[PDB]
Every structure is written in C-alpha cells, then in structure tokens.
Design a protein around this ligand. Structure first.
Ligand code: NAG
Ligand code: NAG
Ligand code: CA
Lengths: 105, 105, 105, 105
C-alpha cells in the first residue's frame, strides 16, 4: 500500500523504464511485462509456463481455440463468462460481474 | 438405519476450492420411508412435494427457526438445523452414540 | 367483479368505503397486469401467461415482488432453479451444469 | 367424473341465517384421485398435506392471485378462484356444457 519511486527492484522483480515505457521484469520467475504510453499492457511468459497457465491471457499452448478456459475448468463460448470467471475480489472492493457495452454501429 | 442424512456438495464459486453444500436429503424408514429434502433458500420438500412449514407428521416435526433456518426433529433423539446457505447442524442424542457412520464418523 | 367479467370496470372504491389498502411499498391498481409481477416471472421468462389485467396491489412499475411481499429491482430478485431458491450473484458449478443468478434468472 | 368440487358450509355469525362456505374440497380422479382442500385463510392441502402454494404437478396448477386469492387450474377445462373468506368462483370450458351436476346445476 506504499507508493514507491521508479526505478525499483525487490524480491527478484525489476521495475524500470525501457524504450520510454514502464517495464516490470521477473525472469527469475520467468515472465516480463510492460505498459506503453497509451496504457496498453503486454506480458511475456517463458516456455516454462507452456500449457501450464490460465487467466484472461489464455492457456499458452499450440491451440488458440481451447483458450477461454474458466476457473471452473469449463470452456465457454462467451468471453465475458471467461473473464468474469477470472475476476479477483479483495478487501479494497468486491466486484460485480461485468457485461458487454451497448452498440449502434 | 432408523435415519440417513445425505448432503449435495457443489462448487459454490468460480474458485476451484470453493465447494459447499447446496442441499440436504433425509431418509426416515420408520416414517413410511419418507424422504425429506432441505433446499437452498431454506425451502423444504417431502417425497417430492413442496411442503409448507410448520409441519408435524407423527414423530417428524419441521419448523422455521428465528434465524429463518429450517429446524427438523424426528422424535427427541434426532434434530437438524439447516440455514439454506449450506450450513447444516445435526444433533444426535446419546441413544445413537457409537451407532453412526458417514462423514460425521 | 361481474362487471369486469362483462368488461366494464367501475371505480367504486373510495375513502368512505372499501379502500384496498396495500402493504408498504406496493401500490393499488384498479387494473394491473399480473404476468410480470413476481420474481418467479423473471426466473421462468419463457412460461406461458395470458391472464387479463385485474384489480389488486402491485409493485411500482420498475420493481418486482419478492417472497417477503417487498418490492425489489430486477437486479435484486432471487432466482428459482429446480424449484430451489438462489440469491443474487449466487454461483454453482457441477459435473452436469454451471450456472449463476442475475436479474432474477 | 373427471372432477368433483365440494363445499363445507358453516354458520358464520351469531345469526341463524348467516351461513357461508368455510372450506372447499376438489377431488381429481384423473390426477391419480388426488384430493385438494382449499382452507380458510387461503391455505391449501393436498392429500391432507399442507403445500407451498405455487404448485404445477401434472395437469393441476395452483397459484397466488394478486388478490392473494388461491387460483387453481386443471388443464384448460377447469379453473377455480378461492378467496379464503368463503368466496369461490368456478369456471368451466364449454367441454363440460350439459355434463355438470350439484348446486351449480
Ligand atoms: C496440456 O495439459 C493437459 C492436462 O491438463 C493435457 O491433457 C494435454 O495433453 C496437454 N497438452 C499439451 C500440448 O501438452
Ligand atoms: C410489466 O409490464 C408492463 C407492460 O405490460 C410494464 O408497464 C411494467 O413496467 C412491467 N413491470 C416491470 C416490473 O417491469
Ligand atoms: Ca490455447
């Protein structure tokens, strides 16, 4: 809960600027992540996590269509059932099931 | 076999480890083999009929607790208290001491 | 009622005689539609219902009627499944199905 | 003999001329000879057992009217509406025209 200045490094994570963008590396654990100036996230996993990961970024295997695996372990055809299945509440807030926005295109 | 109590367990969240009792079923061979189901939301059914509480039927009594929990009694020797949210308390008199089996030993 | 059976509706009640005073939160209507009053109507929205507009106590136009007789928004209605009652945002998951309660369905 | 409706009439005041229906009984031979009693205060019992009123088993359906009156249906061809205060309305489809007997001709 404490604000900390960049660059930073603790517990084997390194948090720094790279190419003008905010970077958060943990290749001891086997990942690295970044936020660009537009606010786009990205995450990279080492092959250590192939077919051994889950969440909104999918399950990391040769198939693309066996993603959307829920925490209940089912597939779903609905991205919002998948993503809400991976929602994590906390003492800071307990969170509602999100739904698609309205459209008129 | 004067009584049997069965519980239905379900995964009560998207979390794998969040498993809880959804419903309870009680079989009473001495009461013409009545089958009593205590349901989610503190409802009750008997032989598949949705009964209205309070109920008295020979040795069997079923009543709403001030907690809105369903309380069931079968004589003075068996009592149960079902909250409708997966909490079940079962009380046996010492008449049953050493005589039980199931998950409660 | 005989008039209404012949399709003539009479505003016969008045504060000097026979006001159909409703429980709190409900409102009197000389004619309201029954088919969408209860939370069960949300929970079984494919059910057949053709019953005519009729006199009674109804929830205000945006609210449904709960088991307590209180009037609740659609998001606050319980859900009814297999004759068994679930609260808003309840989850259950099982080897046959995985389901959740939202908007009374 | 697809249905039989019986009324219990009692003296309903100190007067000898004040007589009203206390309870109603419906026998349904097609519904495995079920006996449905409509009680004073708009309760219902089936084969002597008090039931939670929204009931839909077989051709029989029983429901709370918005008036809090009990409504009963048995296919399309029989309907009943019991207020619990000695008012009973019975509707038959023209399938029963000429076939009825009892006080309603
Ligand atoms: C991924 O893991 C599952 C077990 O969870 C296994 O059945 C499957 O064969 C694995 N796929 C690959 C490509 O290793
Ligand atoms: C029920 O339907 C009527 C239209 O027939 C509508 O005016 C009313 O708002 C509806 N009730 C609810 C709770 O939406
Ligand atoms: Ca995949």
């Amino acid at each position: 809960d404490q604000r900390v200045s960049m660059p930073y490094a603790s517990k084997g994570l390194y948090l720094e600027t790279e190419a003008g963008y905010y970077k958060l590396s943990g290749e001891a654990y086997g990942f690295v992540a970044r936020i660009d100036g537009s606010g786009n996230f990205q995450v990279l996993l080492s092959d250590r996590y192939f077919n051994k990961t889950c969440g909104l970024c999918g399950n990391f295997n040769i198939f693309a269509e066996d993603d959307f695996m829920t925490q209940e372990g089912t597939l779903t055809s609905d991205p919002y059932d998948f993503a809400n299945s991976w929602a994590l509440s906390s003492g800071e807030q307990w969170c509602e099931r999100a739904s698609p926005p309205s459209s008129s295109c | 076999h004067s009584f049997s109590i069965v519980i239905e367990t379900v995964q009560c969240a998207d979390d794998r480890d969040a498993v809880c009792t959804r419903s309870v079923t009680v079989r009473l061979p001495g009461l013409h083999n009545s089958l009593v189901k205590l349901k989610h939301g503190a409802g009750v059914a008997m032989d598949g009929q949705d009964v209205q509480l309070p109920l008295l039927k020979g040795d069997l009594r079923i009543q709403h607790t001030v907690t809105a929990s369903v309380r069931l009694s079968y004589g003075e020797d068996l009592q149960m208290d079902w909250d409708g949210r997966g909490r079940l308390l079962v009380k046996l008199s010492p008449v049953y001491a050493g005589k039980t089996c199931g998950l409660c030993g | 009622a005989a008039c209404a059976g012949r399709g003539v509706r009479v505003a016969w009640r008045e504060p000097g005689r026979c006001e159909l005073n409703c429980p709190k939160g409900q409102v009197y209507l000389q004619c309201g539609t029954p088919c969408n009053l209860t939370c069960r109507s949300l929970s079984y929205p494919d059910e057949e219902c053709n019953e005519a507009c009729l006199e009674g106590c109804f929830c205000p136009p945006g609210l449904y009627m709960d088991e307590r007789g209180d009037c609740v928004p659609k998001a606050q209605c319980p859900c009814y499944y297999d004759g068994e009652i679930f609260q808003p945002e309840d989850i259950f998951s099982d080897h046959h199905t995985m389901c959740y309660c939202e908007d009374g369905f």
